[PDB]
Design a protein around this ligand. Sequence first.
Ligand SMILES: CN[C@@H]1[C@@H](O)[C@@H](O[C@@H]2[C@@H](O)[C@H](O[C@H]3O[C@H](CO)[C@@H](O)[C@H](O)[C@H]3N)[C@@H](N)C[C@H]2N)OC[C@]1(C)O
Ligand SMILES: Nc1ncnc2c1ncn2[C@@H]1O[C@H](CSCC[C@H](N)C(=O)O)[C@@H](O)[C@H]1O
Ligand SMILES: [Mg+2]
Length: 311
Amino acid sequence: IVGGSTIQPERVDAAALRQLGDAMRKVVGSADPTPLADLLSGTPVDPDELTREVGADGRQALLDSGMAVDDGTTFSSPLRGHQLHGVVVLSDPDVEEEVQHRWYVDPLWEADLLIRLMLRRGGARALDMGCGSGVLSLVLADRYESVLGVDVNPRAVALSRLNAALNGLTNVTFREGDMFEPAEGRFSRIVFNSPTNEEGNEFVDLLEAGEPILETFFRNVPRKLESGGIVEVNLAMNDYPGDPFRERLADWLGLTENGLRVQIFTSQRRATESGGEWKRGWLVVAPGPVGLTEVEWPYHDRYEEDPDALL
Ligand SMILES: CN[C@@H]1[C@@H](O)[C@@H](O[C@@H]2[C@@H](O)[C@H](O[C@H]3O[C@H](CO)[C@@H](O)[C@H](O)[C@H]3N)[C@@H](N)C[C@H]2N)OC[C@]1(C)O
Ligand SMILES: Nc1ncnc2c1ncn2[C@@H]1O[C@H](CSCC[C@H](N)C(=O)O)[C@@H](O)[C@H]1O
Ligand SMILES: [Mg+2]
């Protein structure tokens, strides 16, 4: 029921979308919301006051793109607006798992934290695997010559395209497909906010896809990464007695065979039923001495006390 709305940025001229994006820049994320900020907060709004804020040509762009729905008396939006790290972003509202459509898009559960963890370097060509709303691609666009975002959710591809247009970003491309199959060539930068959490090995849905999605990602990383490239992954990791995640990870990447260096920064951990362990952390592949290192970095705790310990 949440996450199935039609999103059609192709039905709106890019100049009209850029203007809606500039209007969002003024009001989204600011106290004392205007009608447009009310609309993109999930509050029904009077179409006339909307029109006075975005014009008569913005109101129809809201409708043609799917950003807004005509209820007759009011306008309402299935999407919610954010402004962070120099971009405006629409995504689905944060709702419980039981009311999520199969094409529900990550409502930015961790995006703001992950952007602060990301290395601040730029480079030639970046890949956003599982791009969702497109948020990570939009931020990378400001320091990469081109960015490709990939998602198997076609609604996320459409939302990403819409968010790119709202921001007037022209060096970002999005493609529908399964993992690396639409990503041709090599990349200097690969980011993956992985759909893994509490499901262990089980595929539950596109947002909890099981460890096999990590195995496919890491097995194919070495042939997609430019030499000297950087990979950054948000992931949940399961250690089992006699079978720690890090050993499987070393096998998937071919650490020695491909000459790669990996660092795992573990932020949260808990004992599990098997006598093993669940962990959430941040994994970086970056040039340096071959092998694997794991360190404790409670960045969730630090984020909650002060978002400023970037890196
Ligand atoms: C893309 N990666 C992500 C990953 O970051 C990570 O996100 C979780 C996120 O699910 C958790 O939301 C959960 O609680 C919310 C509020 O109570 C509910 O409203 C959500 O419905 C519910 N799911 C969040 N509390 C803590 C995040 N760390 O697991 C999923 C992922 C899709 O795989
Ligand atoms: N086989 C697959 N290939 C490509 N993308 C996949 C996939 N399985 C799941 N995904 C996508 O992985 C994404 C994880 S959600 C992360 C969204 C975004 N990067 C953000 O940080 O908010 C989802 O959009 C999901 O549809
Ligand atoms: Mg789910």
